[PDB]
Design a protein around this ligand. Structure first.
Ligand SMILES: [K+]
Ligand SMILES: [K+]
Ligand SMILES: [K+]
Ligand SMILES: [K+]
Ligand SMILES: [K+]
Ligand SMILES: [K+]
Ligand SMILES: [K+]
Ligand SMILES: [K+]
Ligand SMILES: [K+]
Ligand SMILES: [Mg+2]
Ligand SMILES: [Mg+2]
Ligand SMILES: [Mg+2]
Ligand SMILES: [Mg+2]
Ligand SMILES: [Mg+2]
Ligand SMILES: [Mg+2]
Ligand SMILES: [Mg+2]
Ligand SMILES: [Mg+2]
Ligand SMILES: [Mg+2]
Ligand SMILES: [Mg+2]
Ligand SMILES: [Mg+2]
Ligand SMILES: [Mg+2]
Ligand SMILES: [Mg+2]
Ligand SMILES: [Mg+2]
Ligand SMILES: [Mg+2]
Ligand SMILES: [Mg+2]
Ligand SMILES: [Mg+2]
Ligand SMILES: [Mg+2]
Lengths: 151, 206, 82, 99, 101, 127
RNA sequence: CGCGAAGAACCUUACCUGGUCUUGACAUCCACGGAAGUUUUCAGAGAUGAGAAUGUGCCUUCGGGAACCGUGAGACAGGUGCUGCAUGGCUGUCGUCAGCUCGUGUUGUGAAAUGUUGGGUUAAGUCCCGCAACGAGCGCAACCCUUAUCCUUUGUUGCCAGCGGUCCGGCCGGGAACUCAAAGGAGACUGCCAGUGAUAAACUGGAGGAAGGUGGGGAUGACGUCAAGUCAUCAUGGCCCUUACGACCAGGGCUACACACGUGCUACAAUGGCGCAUACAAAGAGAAGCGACCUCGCGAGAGCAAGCGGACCUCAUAAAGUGCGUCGUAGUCCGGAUUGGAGUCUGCAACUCGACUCCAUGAAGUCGGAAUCGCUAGUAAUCGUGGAUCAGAAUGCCACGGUG
């Protein structure tokens, strides 16, 4: 990306709800181009949150999403052979992307039977501000305010 | 870098094929090789008759070979015993009967095959390559050619180290597919080895 | 392996072996045909089968019937590396 | 009856004019001519190594296209058959007739 | 060059249509269970061996027609890859132009 | 009268006939729910008849060929678009803004010599 | 370093052991004797050595001349023997990088410079201004192929909207609308509208449009560099062999195995494994070939046998996908290496050394150290299909579509 600056690419809403955010979620969960599998898994986990521990069925997702979204990041900048870890503000879309990626990768490394109920537990405890996605956020923060002097 | 063959890249665009028969994959290979044999003959017995192109065409079950030549009198001979003594053996080689026609090239200095043959014939007569090359270029350019370039390569003048020496004049746009490019190659077998000659002649676009 | 529709054996080996079982056992029968099935007909005779440079003698026991002759003459020499 | 004519060639202009020559010489004897129809062209591809030795990724790709034309005649008077069997076309066209 | 290899190959071709595609009856037919299930089929299996080691269609290497190269053969033209390229660029194989799709 | 439309996607081709005044979606002599088992294909086919709204205001007889599920669904969308554009002739302006009118011209890229895929390169290593 | 090799059981084959030949396996010329082919005979591993039968084409311008065989003596044949650092031809590479030069003029004693630098701009030595330069050439771009929209023509073997009939299958009558096929034509040009810009060249944005700024992909590789690669495709200067470094045959070997490296395939599972049911492709090949239906076999396959030189017939019922059931986190109903037994088929012949099937066996492996590779969109990832080579023998190579 030296010269050619890029616009954006379209994305469909979700059949069942009509969301772009959750359509992003299932693209990030999809593996190998198996979209049907990922739609099945994500619907199966999200209703499992809603009527087991939860609200109106789109709200129950965003409440777990907001508590893992980071507000500050670290990016590194070189001197002549030194690189400072400078804290930077994260842009909205990158906030959603980082949150979704951390949720998916925390759900992938659990020990329960299905992927739907793994996702279910992780989103449920992200709603309760514990687990490992939220602590991923907490320690990216920790490191960002450890280097607060290099702003 | 290596170049594309300038006649091959223009087949079907502006340059036609040298064989215009049809065949299924049953008789394709033998058609091809009997064409090779006839071409090898009509190369090697018309050696000093200045033949430039041999077009082979196969109607239903028999052949006709059109010989483009600069010196039609020797390939038509003394009242015409010689196209007889040629078709009697071409019908012998291709197994089917044969017919022979003879077309004249009227300016033998605007054909890459004849110019290459000329330069190799002079090189085998122990002539300085510079003089051959420059005479070819000036003779081709004084007859209306829009461009020409010749190139000789390999132990020029008996040197121990081979060299490639080329001479260009006019305009030879090898990257233009519209371009009327007449290209050909020849080899001179001297007492120090083989010397390769390539000739490009540009006559116009479309 | 081969089809059950006929085992294979050569002609010259077949005739050499029949005449050797009529005439009593003899010299190690020199052969090059490593591809021929061992038959019941030559239990007891010694066949020296070619292995590339030599003729290895084999004394046919009844356990060998059904195998090929070449199985009893190794073609490659090898005994350790270092 | 019906007579069926299949034309194969390596280029499309020669076979185009050959099909013309057929279908107007068929209307010249006053016959009904069904067609001409272009059947799908069959293109055979070849891929060759282009160095003399040890250069696996350097290759050339060629193709031969065979063009196929079909024409049916459905009202043959006796002067249509001979009138089609006397016709002179250049060497690139292979014709197959079917009674 | 190795002219002797070309001689071997042409001898195999000639001797092979000499015997087989004419006397395949010794294997294609007599092996049939409807032809024999006994000493006849055995006698045929042993007769198939006294025919020369050649004369099989399975011993032709199918070399090039001009240089005699074993490898890179193309059944469509009867030439090696080198010869089909050198002759295709010169414009001698009908209809064979460079493909780009 | 019939109002007709042709639509095409990756390798599929769909012809669409619309009649006034009934609610049948029938594709290849089958229901929509019998044909497309995936609700995303069902959603893509109902897209153009959601801005151009209906209850059961036109019935549509569709056939399709070639391609897979997504290709056929996109082809049917494009065909419905063209057919209803022949029907009204001035629903065009808002269909342009929905992206339903542009023929998606993304085709699968050819495999190239020396490459394992269209662009995937063999594993390189310095030595 | 899945490179020559687009396919080493024999052959290929160039290597080894042994058995053999010497004007020769391949070619021309000379002399003599036999027309060529036939189809059996015993020895030999085989190359090679030993009888019967036979033909007589052809004009004889009646000596024999033409095809094929045997023997003799020589010019000679033959060499995948060496030199790619003697060469031609062909190829890789920097690199599809934007450059590399020339004529005339001018400047400098001269090697040389200028032009080709400068201000902008572009993917581009692309274009515009300015300028001791003025012009030109090879490159860039365009012309070529393919893909994305529409129109015209033709309408089977391809198609089925409106019609009649039907055994409910476009299958019959029938239609020429539609998909499609393949010829021709149209379309995109910063063409249009705003703004910025040095009244510039061009940049941002908008409209219309199937497509917008090189629309996507390919072919196309400038002057030259690396004494780069190939004398084993071929061709070729010189050197070397000439009862052998040439030629024929059988068996073996190129498949060895303490190890090290490169490129791939299959896994370590639940986004999964197994069982049943059921959808949606594209592009190809086929006459010593593709081989349907039916019958037999658990299966690989076998028997019989139609159709097809092919928009008709066959290869050939796509798989991932969807629905239901089960397994429930285990070295497992994961993995399928290794080995034993029984077979099929191709082929003179599967020991060394083929592919596939059935029953049994069920290693390692639980996501991989230092480190390292590919990819910017129908791409990556994954899932099947086809082709060349080829009697048989792909996890390789070259192509095609699905999901994405
Ligand atoms: K084997
Ligand atoms: K060279
Ligand atoms: K100058
Ligand atoms: K040499
Ligand atoms: K071997
Ligand atoms: K592999
Ligand atoms: K590896
Ligand atoms: K197991
Ligand atoms: K094969
Ligand atoms: Mg073979
Ligand atoms: Mg793909
Ligand atoms: Mg490779
Ligand atoms: Mg410069
Ligand atoms: Mg300068
Ligand atoms: Mg320029
Ligand atoms: Mg200037
Ligand atoms: Mg029409
Ligand atoms: Mg260009
Ligand atoms: Mg070197
Ligand atoms: Mg070397
Ligand atoms: Mg060598
Ligand atoms: Mg051998
Ligand atoms: Mg090897
Ligand atoms: Mg495990
Ligand atoms: Mg890129
Ligand atoms: Mg797979
Ligand atoms: Mg494949």
């Amino acid at each position: 990306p030296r010269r050619r600056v890029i616009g954006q690419r379209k994305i469909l809403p979700d059949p069942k709800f009509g969301s772009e955010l959750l359509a992003k979620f299932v693209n990030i969960l999809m593996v190998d181009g198996k979209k049907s599998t990922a739609e099945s898994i994500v619907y199966s986990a999200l209703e499992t949150l809603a009527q087991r521990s939860g609200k109106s069925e789109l709200e129950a997702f965003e409440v777990a999403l907001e508590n893992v979204r980071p507000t500050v990041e670290v990016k590194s900048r070189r001197v002549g052979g030194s690189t400072y870890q400078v804290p930077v503000e994260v842009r909205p879309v990158r906030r959603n992307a980082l949150a979704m990626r951390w949720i998916v990768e925390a759900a992938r490394k659990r020990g329960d039977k299905s992927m739907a109920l793994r996702l279910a537990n992780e989103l449920s405890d992200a709603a309760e501000n514990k687990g490992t996605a939220v602590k991923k956020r907490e320690d990216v923060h920790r490191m960002a305010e450890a280097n607060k002097a290099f702003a | 870098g290596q170049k594309v063959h300038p006649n091959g890249i223009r087949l079907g665009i502006v340059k036609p094929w040298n064989s215009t028969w049809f065949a299924n994959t049953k008789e394709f290979a033998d058609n091809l090789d009997s064409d090779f044999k006839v071409r090898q003959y009509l190369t090697k017995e018309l050696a000093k008759a200045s033949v430039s192109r041999i077009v082979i065409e196969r109607p239903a079950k028999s052949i006709r070979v059109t010989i483009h030549t600069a010196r039609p009198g020797i390939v038509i001979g003394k009242k015409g015993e010689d196209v007889e003594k040629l078709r009697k053996v071409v019908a012998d080689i291709a197994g089917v009967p044969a017919q022979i026609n003879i077309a004249e090239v009227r300016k033998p200095e605007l054909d890459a095959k004849l110019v290459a043959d000329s330069i190799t014939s002079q090189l085998e007569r122990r002539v300085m390559f510079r003089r051959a090359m420059k005479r070819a270029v000036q003779n081709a350019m004084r007859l209306g050619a829009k461009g020409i370039k010749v190139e000789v390569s390999g132990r020029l003048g008996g040197a121990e180290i081979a060299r490639t020496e080329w001479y260009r004049e006019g305009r030879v746009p090898l990257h233009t597919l519209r371009a009327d490019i007449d290209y050909n190659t020849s080899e001179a077998h001297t007492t120090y080895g083989v010397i390769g000659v390539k000739v490009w002649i540009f006559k116009g676009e479309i | 392996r081969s089809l059950k529709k006929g085992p294979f054996i050569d002609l010259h080996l077949l005739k050499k072996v029949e005449k050797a079982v009529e005439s009593g056992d003899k010299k190690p029968l020199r052969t090059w045909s490593r591809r021929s099935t061992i038959f019941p007909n030559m239990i007891g005779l010694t066949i020296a089968v070619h292995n590339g440079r030599q003729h290895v003698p084999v004394f046919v026991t009844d356990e060998m019937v059904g195998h090929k002759l070449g199985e009893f003459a190794p073609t490659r020499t090898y005994r350790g590396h270092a | 009856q019906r007579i069926r004519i299949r034309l194969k060639a390596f280029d499309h202009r020669l076979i185009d004019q050959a099909t013309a020559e057929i279908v107007e010489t068929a209307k010249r004897t006053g016959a009904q001519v069904r067609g001409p129809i272009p059947l799908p062209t069959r293109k055979e591809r070849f891929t060759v190594l282009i160095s003399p030795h040890v250069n696996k990724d350097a290759r050339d790709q060629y193709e031969i296209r065979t063009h196929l034309r079909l024409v049916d005649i459905v009202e043959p008077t006796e002067k249509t058959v001979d009138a089609l069997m006397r016709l002179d076309l250049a060497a690139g066209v292979d014709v197959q007739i079917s009674l | 060059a190795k002219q002797s290899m070309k001689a071997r190959e042409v001898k195999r071709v000639a001797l092979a249509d000499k015997y087989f595609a004419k006397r395949a009856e010794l294997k294609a037919i007599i092996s049939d269970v409807n032809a024999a299930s006994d000493e006849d089929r055995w006698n045929a299996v042993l007769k198939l061996q006294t025919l020369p080691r050649d004369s099989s269609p399975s011993r032709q290497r199918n070399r090039c027609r001009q240089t005699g190269r074993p490898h890179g053969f193309l059944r469509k033209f009867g030439l090696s890859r080198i010869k089909v390229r050198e002759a295709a660029m010169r414009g001698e194989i009908p209809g064979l132009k460079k493909a780009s799709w | 009268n019939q109002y007709y439309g042709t639509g095409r996607r990756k390798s599929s081709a769909a012809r669409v006939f619309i009649k006034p005044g009934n609610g049948k979606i029938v594709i290849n002599q089958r229901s929509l729910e019998q044909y497309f088992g995936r609700e995303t294909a069902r959603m893509v086919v109902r897209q153009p008849l959601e801005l151009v709204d209906m209850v059961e205001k036109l019935d549509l007889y569709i056939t399709v060929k070639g391609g897979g599920i997504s290709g056929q669904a996109g082809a049917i969308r494009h065909g419905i678009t063209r057919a209803l554009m022949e029907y009204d002739e001035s629903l065009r302006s808002e269909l342009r803004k929905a992206g339903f009118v542009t023929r998606d011209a993304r085709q699968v890229e050819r495999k190239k010599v020396g490459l394992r895929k269209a662009r995937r390169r063999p594993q390189f290593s310095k030595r």
